[PDB]
Design an enzyme around this catalytic site. Sequence first.
Site, PDB file in Angstrom:
ATOM      1  N   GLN A  19       0.806  -1.227   0.000  1.00 58.84           N
ATOM      2  CA  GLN A  19       0.000   0.000   0.000  1.00 58.84           C
ATOM      3  C   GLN A  19       0.843   1.285   0.000  1.00 58.84           C
ATOM      4  O   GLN A  19       0.395   2.363  -0.464  1.00 58.84           O
ATOM      5  CB  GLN A  19      -1.001  -0.004   1.157  1.00 58.84           C
ATOM      6  CG  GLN A  19      -0.419   0.207   2.531  1.00 58.84           C
ATOM      7  CD  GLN A  19      -1.463   0.005   3.622  1.00 58.84           C
ATOM      8  OE1 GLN A  19      -2.119  -1.026   3.674  1.00 58.84           O
ATOM      9  NE2 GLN A  19      -1.583   0.978   4.530  1.00 58.84           N
ATOM     10  N   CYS A  46      -5.432   0.365   3.370  1.00 59.30           N
ATOM     11  CA  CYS A  46      -5.558  -1.001   3.913  1.00 59.30           C
ATOM     12  C   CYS A  46      -6.958  -1.561   3.741  1.00 59.30           C
ATOM     13  O   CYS A  46      -7.140  -2.713   3.397  1.00 59.30           O
ATOM     14  CB  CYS A  46      -5.167  -1.072   5.407  1.00 59.30           C
ATOM     15  SG  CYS A  46      -6.202  -0.024   6.540  1.00 59.30           S
ATOM     16  N   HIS A  91      -6.920  -0.799  11.450  1.00 56.62           N
ATOM     17  CA  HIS A  91      -6.232  -1.294  10.263  1.00 56.62           C
ATOM     18  C   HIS A  91      -7.034  -2.450   9.664  1.00 56.62           C
ATOM     19  O   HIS A  91      -7.385  -3.379  10.369  1.00 56.62           O
ATOM     20  CB  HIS A  91      -4.838  -1.745  10.652  1.00 56.62           C
ATOM     21  CG  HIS A  91      -4.020  -2.267   9.511  1.00 56.62           C
ATOM     22  ND1 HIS A  91      -3.565  -1.461   8.497  1.00 56.62           N
ATOM     23  CD2 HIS A  91      -3.535  -3.503   9.258  1.00 56.62           C
ATOM     24  CE1 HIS A  91      -2.864  -2.184   7.645  1.00 56.62           C
ATOM     25  NE2 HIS A  91      -2.841  -3.433   8.078  1.00 56.62           N
ATOM     26  N   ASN A 101      -2.027  -9.161   5.000  1.00 52.66           N
ATOM     27  CA  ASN A 101      -1.863  -7.720   5.174  1.00 52.66           C
ATOM     28  C   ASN A 101      -1.526  -7.107   3.790  1.00 52.66           C
ATOM     29  O   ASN A 101      -1.487  -7.825   2.772  1.00 52.66           O
ATOM     30  CB  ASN A 101      -0.778  -7.469   6.236  1.00 52.66           C
ATOM     31  CG  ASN A 101      -0.738  -6.041   6.753  1.00 52.66           C
ATOM     32  OD1 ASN A 101      -1.613  -5.226   6.476  1.00 52.66           O
ATOM     33  ND2 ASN A 101       0.313  -5.725   7.504  1.00 52.66           N
TER      34      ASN A 101
HETATM   35  C1  LIG Z   1      -5.579   1.630   6.613  1.00 55.66           C
HETATM   36  N1  LIG Z   1      -4.416   1.668   6.046  1.00 55.66           N
HETATM   37  C2  LIG Z   1      -6.112   2.632   7.543  1.00 55.66           C
HETATM   38  N2  LIG Z   1      -7.251   2.248   8.196  1.00 55.66           N
HETATM   39  C3  LIG Z   1      -7.846   3.084   9.084  1.00 55.66           C
HETATM   40  C4  LIG Z   1      -9.070   2.552   9.721  1.00 55.66           C
HETATM   41  C5  LIG Z   1      -9.778   3.270  10.697  1.00 55.66           C
HETATM   42  C6  LIG Z   1     -10.935   2.753  11.292  1.00 55.66           C
HETATM   43  C7  LIG Z   1     -11.421   1.495  10.926  1.00 55.66           C
HETATM   44  O1  LIG Z   1     -12.540   0.911  11.451  1.00 55.66           O
HETATM   45  C8  LIG Z   1     -13.470   1.745  12.144  1.00 55.66           C
HETATM   46  C9  LIG Z   1     -14.257   0.869  13.117  1.00 55.66           C
HETATM   47  C10 LIG Z   1     -15.163  -0.107  12.363  1.00 55.66           C
HETATM   48  N3  LIG Z   1     -16.320   0.545  11.730  1.00 55.66           N
HETATM   49  C11 LIG Z   1     -16.964  -0.315  10.711  1.00 55.66           C
HETATM   50  C12 LIG Z   1     -18.240   0.323  10.113  1.00 55.66           C
HETATM   51  N4  LIG Z   1     -19.230   0.669  11.149  1.00 55.66           N
HETATM   52  C13 LIG Z   1     -20.393   1.323  10.555  1.00 55.66           C
HETATM   53  C14 LIG Z   1     -18.593   1.545  12.150  1.00 55.66           C
HETATM   54  C15 LIG Z   1     -17.325   0.902  12.755  1.00 55.66           C
HETATM   55  C16 LIG Z   1     -10.739   0.752   9.955  1.00 55.66           C
HETATM   56  C17 LIG Z   1     -11.239  -0.609   9.538  1.00 55.66           C
HETATM   57  F1  LIG Z   1     -12.465  -0.575   8.945  1.00 55.66           F
HETATM   58  F2  LIG Z   1     -11.340  -1.486  10.577  1.00 55.66           F
HETATM   59  F3  LIG Z   1     -10.423  -1.225   8.632  1.00 55.66           F
HETATM   60  C18 LIG Z   1      -9.574   1.289   9.366  1.00 55.66           C
HETATM   61  C19 LIG Z   1      -7.345   4.353   9.377  1.00 55.66           C
HETATM   62  C20 LIG Z   1      -6.181   4.727   8.701  1.00 55.66           C
HETATM   63  C21 LIG Z   1      -5.544   3.890   7.780  1.00 55.66           C
HETATM   64  N5  LIG Z   1      -4.425   4.525   7.275  1.00 55.66           N
HETATM   65  C22 LIG Z   1      -4.377   5.699   7.858  1.00 55.66           C
HETATM   66  N6  LIG Z   1      -5.414   5.866   8.725  1.00 55.66           N
HETATM   67  C23 LIG Z   1      -5.654   7.041   9.525  1.00 55.66           C
END
Ligand SMILES: *C(=N)c1nc(-c2ccc(OCCCN3CCN(C)CC3)c(C(F)(F)F)c2)cc2c1ncn2C
Length: 217
Positions: free
Chosen positions: A19, A25, A164, A184
């Site tokens: 990436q 991710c 992530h 990953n």
């Molecule tokens: C990847 N390189 C990357 N991923 C994230 C990031 C932030 C938050 C995440 O999940 C939020 C919690 C799960 N939600 C799912 C949908 N629901 C409606 C609410 C809850 C994820 C995830 F989805 F788990 F993959 C990923 C932030 C990143 C990032 N690179 C840089 N940043 C800031």
Amino acid sequence: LPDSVDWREKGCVTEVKYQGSCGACWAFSAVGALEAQLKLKTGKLVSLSAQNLVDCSTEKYGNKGCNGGFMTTAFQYIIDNKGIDSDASYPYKAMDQKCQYDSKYRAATCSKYTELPYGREDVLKEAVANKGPVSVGVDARHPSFFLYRSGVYYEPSCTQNVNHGVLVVGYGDLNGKEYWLVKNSWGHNFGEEGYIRMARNKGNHCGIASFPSYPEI
Ligand SMILES: *C(=N)c1nc(-c2ccc(OCCCN3CCN(C)CC3)c(C(F)(F)F)c2)cc2c1ncn2C
């Protein structure tokens, strides 16, 4: 349920992607899950465009491109859009760009997705065994995750706060230590040549069963 599963043995997992400095991710995790369903549906294993998600599954989907996003909303985009382009036709650039989707390059469709119940590792196991690889969020906000080389990963300061997006492509055990086999998107030099084995049935370790989902073609 089988004691061990590896979807790589079933020809349903594409090469590990890199990436880079773009936080895509969630995009790679989403295309990973759909790639497996594409193979199961059609016989073809084809890398799908992560870039297409980054550029097109944007504000409307609550996603932020290279600053993160959601696998579930990525799937809804592919549903709403009636397609996702091949990675060949729409290659990865590790930056946010204007949407360049074109239906003439469509490699897959999505009709629905399914979100698994919070923290249930047994339900996750059943999905991985019977449906395909499952997109998951994990807590990767710890130096041990970056430093991981081999074996079954266990970080005692890990939380259930996920940040992530990765892809569970199997599970099993190493001398009785139970794991999730995780693809990953930090390239083929991270961990076990792109993969990490994460502690399984260790109380939702690193939030691995916090927010699991999978698509259907
Ligand atoms: C990847 N390189 C990357 N991923 C994230 C990031 C932030 C938050 C995440 O999940 C939020 C919690 C799960 N939600 C799912 C949908 N629901 C409606 C609410 C809850 C994820 C995830 F989805 F788990 F993959 C990923 C932030 C990143 C990032 N690179 C840089 N940043 C800031």
